[PDB]
């Protein structure tokens, strides 16, 4: 999901299922890996504290200027055509160079 | 109008700055509900009187 | 307190992330008017009863 | 126009990309661990290259 050799395109974004496993995201704060990291429906630091039922990941690559439009309700050339987020979307958005 | 109706979920999910926003929306709605409840109960109590 | 008082207009001009906020403001105001109206209706109901 | 009682200036240098995380309620390495701003903080943030 994070360290995969090659992510799939946003046109055909990989459909990954994460279940029956321990989710530990302290690695992001335990090592400087990703430049951009934000959460909308939850707290970045409480992801480990709070346990979810079915955690799902979405991997894709887009242009740098297209990152700002990756969020709930956003509109643009990427949001409204290939990959979009629900307006009531609950999750986090991760980006790095 | 919040993400969830449970204050525990809000506290366990969002950081303070957004946690107070969600909890404030919940307080606003729930306080309007209780305000209407008390007004209707006062009218009913006046009728009972 | 919203930008506009028409739902078709607010949908048309604004994107959904802010359109929903403005619609929430308008909904809160229009409800609040409803609870006003109903409370004075109940008060006139008590006096006329 | 608005005159303050006691003004305290905190001067520090951080990564170029960590400036956006320096504000009340923001998250990040410095913000969360090293230098944090109060959620209800009243003030201004200034940065330059």
Curated annotation (Swiss-Prot), chains B, C:
It comes from the Viruses. Changing residue 12 to A: In strain: Alpha/B.1.1.7. Changing residue 11 to F: In strain: Omicron/BA.1. Subunit of the fusion protein that is processed upon entry into the host cell. Mediates fusion of the virion and cellular membranes by functioning as a class I viral fusion protein. Contains a viral fusion peptide that is unmasked after S2 cleavage. This cleavage can occur at the cell membrane by host TMPRSS2 or during endocytosis by host CSTL. In either case, this triggers an extensive and irreversible conformational change that leads to fusion of the viral envelope with the cellular cytoplasmic membrane, releasing viral genomic RNA into the host cell cytoplasm. This is Spike protein S2'. It comes from Severe acute respiratory syndrome coronavirus 2 (2019-nCoV). The chain holds residues 971 to 1019 of 1273 of the full protein.
